[model samples]
Target: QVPWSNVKSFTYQLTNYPQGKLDAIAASKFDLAIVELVRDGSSGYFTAAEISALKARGKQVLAYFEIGAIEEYRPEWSQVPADLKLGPVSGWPDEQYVKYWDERWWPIVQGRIDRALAAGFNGCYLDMVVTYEEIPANSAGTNRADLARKMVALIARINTYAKARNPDFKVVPQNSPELVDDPAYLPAIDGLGMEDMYWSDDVACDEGWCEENRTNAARVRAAGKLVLSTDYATQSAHVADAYTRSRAAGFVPYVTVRALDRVTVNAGWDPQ
Candidate 1:
């Protein structure tokens, strides 16, 4: 596995796992890979042998974990007590924003990490941390800041839990770069994964939000943490520009489509 200190190129792919897909990823030279722990819309999680193949090729793999939400299709979804589920996540009809602050929910989310560890992932890429900010839409009358703090705590616990089993485990949360503002946060996570540093879905992102992300990412690095950036820029020009732009900001950037179903290597700035 490529050590975190040595990762210069990365990719985020969560689907389209046909016969050659795993082999392709394993053989590629991306130093870091953020992949779905469980295949989207399917029940099968990647096996240990598959993950080991990637690591054996000197790739560091991070399993995508939906910690702040739960998908209805997962085998564990039906097992979560109904009361713990708040409501559906916006844009994702199949996923429900979880009451992650609830005491009972910790074990369930942590259990998912346990499964990832058993599968031999070097670390985890946490999605849905935005659920803390999404809570008000799902449940009425809440303190957003407090929810954010709780979210930090949950991630910290996940780090502790994962590390108990493997000292090298890493925890990276996507989208909620603001969590780095909390003093307790930087220590608990290995990095912050931002989906769109400069562009989102082939278009330029909001000026202010992009700046906020860059600022937070710089702070994360100042604290000696990694910032994994992904931009869904489809056009060849946009894809090439996105890589140069994010690289200019001192980040590990990747350009791909939103589906994140296949590995993309921009012609000139190939991760290889």
Candidate 2:
């Protein structure tokens, strides 16, 4: 693996196992990877072999987990006890996607933690965590703030649970830059994995986003935690600019792409 000091990469999601994807990523000189994990019956977790390959190529691996909802991948979704299931999350439709607070969701989510340790992942990136001012009615009056609280609690619980299993397990959160100022969340997480920093219609409009992220990075750095700020924009040149600015501002920058269209060696993409 790359020395932690030079590990400048961040998170990416895999919708499918595209051919040559890993080799391409390795060639790109990404120092770390975060793979999404769902509880589907088809072995939805990242495999040990993939982790080994990343390690062999000097990349750190972290499995991704979503705890607030039920994915179609989990085998026990239909079989889940009725009392455990809850209401509709805003973006996801229907009751099927809702998660129960009291039921097996806890164990199921925790299982991902255990699986990550077993598979040799350096850590996990827990996503979809933040406030929910517009929680759907089916979800038992759980507002955005309440949901955020639960998420923090869940992370703390996971940290405790994970440390017991493997002390080295790192549990990071994919949180919004705004939440860094909130006392409820700022103290609970090991670090921040910021998203949507540059997915904007106008670069000028995104300047505020970048400033807020820089502030967030400063706060986390003050607390001595890592910050992996991400930009999910398709504009390569703009993303390169953001990457340069973020690193200059002392944040580890991550650019998210939809697919491997092309790699730009200009504006500072160097494998050496």
Candidate 3:
């Protein structure tokens, strides 16, 4: 696994950018870069050579994928059975929640991992793990605890599957620290990523929420797992403080626009 303790800065951009943009990303000097498994609706955007180039620059790269929700734009969407598709995710019409416990869902998730590994990614950045909480007991016929357990188990299974292929394959799940708080789920991942660690104009930051997230993150760190923090702030004014507060709380923080297309990096904060 990459030594996250030595990583003081990182960048995340899931949307596809042109070759020049990708080159800029490789040249960005961040310790880590998390991007889509495929770019521009295909897996051909970045070749193995390009990935190697990034690694040569001493940057760890992680492919981004949604584990609990299937987006319509994803190439795997058409392959997903209608029976497994649930309702649309809030604020994301393009994505629909999946019956993650269903056996059929595993193949798609595994297949995405296969592609990421084949593309020479160092690890995976899994999103939407907390979507399990979005499903109500009355709707899914299971209580929140049961649903959380299943989600945690699924992450463990994915880690096993990935490690079987590449022993060093790292799994860093984003958000959903509540799931990580469970002892049973803590061992399933290499790290935890807390999104909205600080808020932007659209959503005001809540002290209670920050305190709860800090507690959860502290638990994960105590277990020897990395904790990454991300906040969406479209305005440039809030970017600097986001980094300062997040780092003060002992997290590797990245502040990006809501779309995650561009990021702000402070050269002074790079790992020594």
Candidate 4:
């Protein structure tokens, strides 16, 4: 199993940068790095050799894939039936939610996971898991609780399929705390990621949100799974606070720009 407990610092980036730049970043000594499965606007980017090189240098690389939604700009967008698309995701016009319960969608999602594994990624960083909660009961004719349960089933299936291909395959779902309580979901995942756990903007990290996130992190830890926390901030003070509070709450935390392309690595933190 991957050593989640020893990860002191990490970075997340989805935008495509030159391979040399990526190599330099990998050599920067972060214990883990999360990036897109493929280069932006291309069918593939990272090669198995590149992934191996990173691993040889002691970096755990996770490929990012959006599971709960499909974007208009993706190469597979045209293949998706119109009926399966729910609607535009709020604030992201080009991205739209999908009927996740539809069986047809699983093949598409599975293909992405397979591609990620074939590329030699250490694991997968699943985004948009919260879409299960955003799906309206009236729209899908399934109650919220049932929908959540279905999401857990889907995650379990995906985890099983991926593990079959690579027994060490890791699945880390981002930003879906509701699933933390599901008996099957937490066990199926290697770790849990909370995005925007702390922010210095209008989006409030009020007591309710903080309490919920802390409780979820605790639950993840108690389950013997790792909790990864990410916060967006531009100021040094805010960044420090995010790291301090997140670490205090028993999580491996990283503060990055909202774009998440690059982040400042603090002193005394290096890959183990």
Candidate 5:
């Protein structure tokens, strides 16, 4: 296993960065980047060569993907059957949570992983998997525990499928740290990423929220898996607090603006 705790710094760039350039970012020093697979000539997806280039600089690059929700902007949106869409994710109007347990969604999820592998990304940073907790279970066969189990199963299936293709391919689900308690969850993933664990964009996270994350993250550390934590903030004081708390918790931390459109390196707190 990789010594993930020793990894000192990282960047997360999903959509925009102020005049962001792949080469410029790739050229800059960072141990890792959780990057959007999309590139552009009017905003296109990253190509195999681009992923290769990202890794050629000697860093790990994981492509960004959404498995628990379907974004309107994705080409695969139209492929989703109406029944598969459970509802809209609250904050993200462009995204809709899906019935991940449904058989129809497997191929869809696999397709996203397929592209990342084909393009040569080392792994995927899966978002919106919190859908497991948000969606209410219906009386029709599945209960709450079973619903969560479905998500764990889905991740395990993804791991199995992707690993067969590339054995080292990592699956890192963002923002769902509690899933770590699930017996199968830890083994199925190489890393667990949770955002807003300490600060949610300048505001300290609610005590209960932060503590729950802390408790679960402790178990993850004991399990010896990678714990990638992200906080959104811009104020200098806030940035330092987010970094210290995250590092104290034994997490690999990244603090950036909410837009996540750029590589933000806060002054005086750059992890060296």
Candidate 6:
């Protein structure tokens, strides 16, 4: 069982059903599982049976929602009207993409939250909120701070709706280093989801960055919310060590991977 006050750990995976791998994870004792909605527009990727199975095993399953911007799978993408079709993020015209994001994409994200609730997800784990600010301005304003605020607003709104639907619903916003110092988005969320910390290879954590990550967790507690810090390792022992270290340091740790099996890593935790 999670301490509720301490940070939890999970991973982002693109698998459909994820049975073969989920079983392995279950044996390893993960507390939660954040998986793609698969139901981009309609018809979810993981069926009710799949979700039921996870819950049956006593895992906390959270539906993954990418709210920063729309990808190709959204219904509005088709409604872009031929002239508005952005074609592709690259090679195609940029104006249409920018217009779609500014106009259509934002609203669609709001809709996705409702859809996630209706689909029986306990709560949602929002991803890519930092992307809008980082993407190069291909004509569109794409202001990072402004977009971050908008994303946070959406998260807050969703939190309200989800709590009404299921008070126990868990909502986590995955943020990059850019959001660490900004408290504007903090009040709207129930939990903090951080990925690619400075500890990992792809995104090295400088001393300052590590401090930011730790301080962010403190801020979350100061706000009376939970923190879920995610880290990745191909090997089970590495994940276990990371979790042990994180907990000893006073932060809740969640170990995650798209592959491999280390059933004893963090045994006896419920992950959905």
TM-scores, one per candidate:
0.93, 0.78, 0.90, 0.91, 0.91, 0.71
User: What TM value does model 5 have?
Assistant: 0.91
Best candidate per TM-score, number? 1
Give the residue spans of candidate 4 off by over 4 A. Answer: 19-21, 91-93, 200-204, 267-272
Worst 10-residue lDDT window, candidate 5 = 1-10
Report the candidate with higher TM-score, 2 versus 3: 3
Per-candidate total of colliding backbone pairs: 0, 4, 0, 0, 5, 10
Q: List the residue pairs that clash in candidate 5.
A: 16-261, 17-261, 17-262, 39-44, 40-44
**Candidate 6 off by > 4 Å:** 1-12, 16-28, 39-43, 73-76, 79-103, 136-144, 177-184, 202-204, 235-241, 258-272
- Give lDDT for model 1: 0.83
Model 3 poorest 10 in a row by lDDT? 263-272
Q: Give the alpha carbon lDDT tens digit for every residue of 1-272 in model 2.
A: 77544667654655544452445544556677766553232365556776777778888777777666564455546655655545445545333443435445677777778888877887888865542323453354656655555556666777888877877677787765455655756555666677655554324335665667667767776776677766655466777776777677666776655441333232354344
- After superposition, candidate 1 runs with Cα above 4 Å error: 91-93, 137-142
lDDT of each: 0.83, 0.61, 0.78, 0.77, 0.79, 0.57
Which of candidates 1 and 6 reaches a greater lDDT? 1
Candidate 5 lDDT, tens digit per residue, 18-132? Answer: 3544775687567778887776312377788877776787768887888888878787888788888877788775678888878888888888898889888889998878888
- In candidate 1, which residue pairs get closer than 3 Å at backbone N, Cα or C atoms, i.e. clash? none
Best to worst by lDDT, what's the order?
A: 1, 5, 3, 4, 2, 6
Q: What is the lDDT of residue 213 in candidate 1?
A: 80
Candidate 4 scores a C-alpha RMSD against the true structure in Å of: 2.4
Q: Best candidate, lDDT-wise?
A: 1
Cα TM-score of candidate 1:
0.93
